[PDB]
């Protein structure tokens, strides 16, 4: 139901959070945000739907409200359900839209930072798709594709598989802080 | 001596603003069983965020095996304990360290925990651990600038392994090679220095560094053909002569692409395994308790693949076992079933529950055979 | 025929229902006893076929809250609702006369001010050398709203007080038309076009 | 083992000699590099290259512009959309098309000359044409040109031969978050500097079906697409339509309800909301004599159609008027042959013949076909793909304020932050060469602007440099210094300016702008690591090696524990190349329905509890 | 900058070639003749038509062809034909010449017939979208192949009691109307052929030991042609040899007015040379660049032999002076893709060797080849 490109969480943040961005959750959520301007407000659906269309390459402050409304009223959950596909068990999840972004030239979808590896982190030339899930019910039954059923190796009996590995940047980072001749040796602490 | 004890669970109940507030100093850290590892605060407070499936079972012991220098064990003589290197941190290693972690807790209560949660807690633990590193440690960033190529460059052993080379196969991939290996495993020379200290962390490859702090040698054609003259210079003092560069024109770009192109052809033959594997069906835990055990030999090439399995001997789940290593040996499989996990063996275990076996199966086949090409 | 998107017509079959949100939208000063003397009687027409004068008539008025190319893509339930809501409007700005042909089973001065209400018009062939003026785009369409209504006789189905509202004496129940029915469409047409000028 | 000597010159590398220290980089990054200019869009901040070869010189002179191809003199300047003071008068003319007689020729030939306003060779993507003054104000019916006399130049080639091929952007290397699988840290004021701009256009039809909407106007006038200068609506639709119906007349053909844009049962063209138009080209079938446009519709479309027939006109009497004079002897261009097939297609017939049908590409025209072209900015946000003149491309994937950004303690401001630790893993190492020599070559500039008395990271006035170059004994002595750190790096061009007359303009332009600009060709006889560790063992000529403080991921200032070399990159902007439910709810119209009215019907849309 | 210092760049720069910098598409075709003002592809068409002018009967005579106006380009576009007068407005680079034939005097009807019309920077616009012209390499005299030996003709061009005048028409057909003079322009490459046999003698004495023990390099880039015009004009050349053997296979009997004007409506029609321009043509791409510069891939594209057709790939020291090696795309990655503009071509295309740079390319070629 929806197509773009990724980014990363570079933040702390949580292993399954999409942060869609403003063009394409204004036309994926087009009927969650007429059904609120049909409520809170006292607008029509022609006038609602004049309202969506008009704001898809503008923001405004009253649909960015509406969208932390419709994130909040997931109560048991951290947003709404979603099954993020790649063409070519890891390659399709099932994460939450927690944020929408305010800045309308950033066209991307923005996965998580730790699940870049299960399938392959091509920030160049990969498209991605999105599928919303209308209900709790299919939001249940997509469970069993999730960020944590493909951490078990299915190569040997007891291990982790190394989708789990963390990248570059942040382990030399831990490299440059726990090795670093920072406390004198045993024999001379003494 | 001056040397504070702490205990390994009475870390793992402390708070982060308590547990990154440590003082800095060589302790103690009593564990549950009967060792004691000596070690300093910067590394047993990464050993802690590797302990995040422990948090949640408060009756689990915590073995000595579960820090990352766990070499170092208090003994009676002080000389087994005084300068002794100990775990290099790694990518892989704080992986390891949550696995024992969820199989300390799937052998702590007698095979009674659905594995979906410690994979959970795995994932969840490796998220915090990210959360806590990246927000806590701001001003320890690697850089890389000039001074740091002509440290590595300056080393009068590397500067020896590039003049007097005999341009064959031999003094150069044997001398010049191993003359530069050997002190690049050294870790004495170089201290502080980001690509050192970065290949010995598994971020950098030596493969790549032989190209460029020494000679690179011999490259090849469309077919492979070596041109009888090796490159005389590496990547750092550059190549600049007709012959040379045009020998590394042919083997940069024309053997990625090749490399790239026999990808997608591969591609057919996993999709007809992965249909036809899909009649063998659901994997239901249990022992069916069938007197049908095959006979199989053993080999030391197929020993690993024997990892997990249900040995029978008079009446067992490792792949380290040296001996019975050419013995044909009894012990059960899928072949008979009156499929069940002792059958199917411990790799079962990993495997979720609505999830075909046999289509599993044909992707761990299929992987592997494009991971090597 | 112009694929609108699928779903979008669901909210167009969803919005119809919502009557007196319609009403008030286009004339805040209407009874809401009227409008509901106008919804008792959709049920007993909800099994009567719509013929397109009611749906001409619906279409012209209730285009300021409503789409009027969206009544060939809703259902029966929708069109009736809102045929409901166009009798409150013409019971309410005093067009009794045509607002008794809404709820319905079967059995000049104004062209100066249609020419300013309606300046765009339709542009005409001439006819050996002579240039002809152009024709109001508004009269062909309540030529054609004139012509379904004399094209047969009607039954009336709606309130009681609507029919004695305009002066009609019961013989049979069975609807007439009257002679200033052209005017006083074109009386409605002209009240349209200052509502959205 | 001939470290110091180099053997190939600019004539055996095609484009790898635009860039330095090519033997440095590996060639699947060399040829990486090559693959990633011809890809990169012009942008709004070009300069020329701090590290310049003779390669630089030589690509400017060979662009797509506006050129006069042989000894000519003008015969008639003609200009589309005439400007001026009355009440149609369209501003800010985009063509201006001029016609020459070729001179010294036996066969006087006859040309035309188009200079319009930009030239987009890719879709989305183009540059515009910048006039030369001091000719384009020369243009007379009556002048004589030379020959490759260039009007309308682009603007990345200077008055001084160099071309912009990019911006240099202060770099830093740390092992952030944001660095993650060729992940950048981009500074909010430099993306400023890194704005492309983007030509579309789009296409109108509006005949027999259906006709135009009342958009961009008042209740007075009927306007329905933006004039020449005028930028497009907030929401960016540009000529609604709707179809013909007399019997909605009084609901749909109303000043209000033509206002009004419904986004179902029409069909809007959406464009940038924020862009300029530039060009409007309208074609118009007069040959019916009803027309089904109502009356009051076609008040813009008539002011542009009948400016653009006088054109047309005006061109094809030209013609006429030189064929009745040189009978059988015109010969001309090829491009003007084409201009007045052009010209005899637009204008109409009389009725002695048949009508044209006029098509475009089998899609057949239907009374009027608006042709809008408009020019939009794009500025930088996410997925914007960047490179650093090597091998090595990033996706931008944060973006921090200028405050937040990594400072020297000199006061140098950072642009970029890219992960260092791929430099081993792609062996591209001329990076670390233009990065060290660059920050080596800015802190001389630096510093040679603390000794005088002036401020560093500002451009001094004409006044104080005046007061500078006063006194002798200071600017002797920093060219002695400017020519020692030549000495180092670029032995050539110590060979090359110790022959220099008037050494003052060379600090003058030193001091003028933040660096020394270096040529270094691909044959330059200096040892790399050998000028590095003469950099780093020297009391001058010294980059400055120390802290760097920044704001974290958090609310925080910190200062890193590593000392940071902070240096520039000639960067540039690249562009952008069970279950069984789930398939019932797309293959089946009825259990769409049901989920959009389980979605509209709820009272929270999120959480539904089973959509059927 | 500082201008002296541009000075002293400017003065240790080398030039690049500006006839293929600017484009050798728009030189090889639309380049005018300082006495008659005539473009080399109606010189092109003039010497492909007077060596067909030995299968024409006698009084037949092609005269010369002329250029047309504007108004007889507008009025032959747009032609009514079935009450119904097509125009196609869309921008694209068209001029319209006439083909002026004669039989015993008689000048009979003229053909129209449309041209691509170059611009500079080999950047052509054909029905609205811009295209790009890239030349070939075109192997002088003979091509040899890896299978066998092959010599490319303009006609037809082969890899090495009712019945019997069958046979004798194939070789009358193949003796005097395969003796071109632009072919023996071209097999001056240590070939002494002037008689149809004497090929087929050298072919089997002199280029006999081509098949083993041959002296070809097989993967060099010297002694070429670099053709654009023969490549681009395939379609008419196939119109003009059609031509030719409806003259010659057919018949030789009596002709009228009326059969010779049926003929020239029927093999030269008004778009011959445009019909496959954008479908089969190789060396016609289309032009995707957002800059400004014409140098990086609008008009330094070479297509090989192989690639107009829509191992060899082994490195060699010309591939340093006629292409450019480390600029190695997807497709031609061999390092015979884009042009190097800074190689000496002579006229005719022909590229020859540089003198200041061979000694280091032949110690390079020796030094490629040792085992
Ligand atoms: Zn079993």
Redesign the pocket.
Known sequence: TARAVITSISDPHDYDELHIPWGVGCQLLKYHLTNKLKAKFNMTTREAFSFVYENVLQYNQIIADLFKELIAEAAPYKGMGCTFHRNPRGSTQQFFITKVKDDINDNSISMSVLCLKAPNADFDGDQLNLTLMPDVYLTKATERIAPHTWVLSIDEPHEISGNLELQGPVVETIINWAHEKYLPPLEEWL | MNLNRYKARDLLNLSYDDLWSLPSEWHLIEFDDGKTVVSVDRITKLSVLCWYPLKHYKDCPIPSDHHIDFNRILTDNPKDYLNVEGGRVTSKAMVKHLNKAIWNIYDWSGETVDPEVLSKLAIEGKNWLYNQTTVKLSEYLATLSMFDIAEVYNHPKVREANHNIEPTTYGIEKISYGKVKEVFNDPTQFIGNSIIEGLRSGTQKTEQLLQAFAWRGFPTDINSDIFKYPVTTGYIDGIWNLYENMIESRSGTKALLYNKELLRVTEYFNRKSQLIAQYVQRLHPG??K?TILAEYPVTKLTLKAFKGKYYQKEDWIRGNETHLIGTKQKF?S?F?????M???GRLGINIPKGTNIGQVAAVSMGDKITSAV | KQRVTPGDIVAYNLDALDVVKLVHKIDDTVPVELIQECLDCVAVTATKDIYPHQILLAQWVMHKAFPARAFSHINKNAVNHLLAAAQSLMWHWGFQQVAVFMQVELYIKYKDVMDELYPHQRQQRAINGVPVAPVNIAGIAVQSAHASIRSSNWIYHGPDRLFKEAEQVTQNKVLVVPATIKSVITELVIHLGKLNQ | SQLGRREIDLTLLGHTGLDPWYGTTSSARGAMFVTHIGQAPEVNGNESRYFLTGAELEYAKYTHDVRFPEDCRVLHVLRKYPTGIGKDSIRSNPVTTIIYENYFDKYKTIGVLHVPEYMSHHQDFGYELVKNREVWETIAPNEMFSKDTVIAQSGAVKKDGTLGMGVNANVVFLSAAGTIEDGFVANKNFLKRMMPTSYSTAVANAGRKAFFLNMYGDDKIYKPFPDIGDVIRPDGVIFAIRDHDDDLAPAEMTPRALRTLDRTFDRAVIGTPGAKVIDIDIWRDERVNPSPTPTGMDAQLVKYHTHLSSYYRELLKIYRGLLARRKDDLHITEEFERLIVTAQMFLPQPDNVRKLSRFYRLDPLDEWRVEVTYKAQKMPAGAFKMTDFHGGKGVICKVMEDEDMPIDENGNRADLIIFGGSTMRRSNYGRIYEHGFGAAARDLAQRLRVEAGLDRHAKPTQQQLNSVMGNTQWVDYAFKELLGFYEIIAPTMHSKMMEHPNPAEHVKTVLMDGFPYIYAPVDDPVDLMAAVNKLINSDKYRPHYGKVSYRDQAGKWVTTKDNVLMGPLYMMLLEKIPTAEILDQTNNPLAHAAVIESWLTAEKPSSVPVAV | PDPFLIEKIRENTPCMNPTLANGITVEHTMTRDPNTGVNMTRRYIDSLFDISSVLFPDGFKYEGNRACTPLKHFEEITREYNAKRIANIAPTDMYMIDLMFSYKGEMLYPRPMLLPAFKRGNMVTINGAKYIGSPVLTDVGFSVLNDSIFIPFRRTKLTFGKVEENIDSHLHSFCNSLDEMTIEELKTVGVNVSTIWELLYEIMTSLAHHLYATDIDETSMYGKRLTVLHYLMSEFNYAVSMFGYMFQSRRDREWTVQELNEGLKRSFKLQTAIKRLTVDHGELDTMSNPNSSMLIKGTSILVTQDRAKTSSRIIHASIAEVGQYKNQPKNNPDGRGRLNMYTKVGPTGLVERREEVREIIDNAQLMFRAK
Do not use: F, L
């Open positions: 022992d069916c069938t059960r899928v008979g079933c009156n499929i069940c002792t059958c199917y």
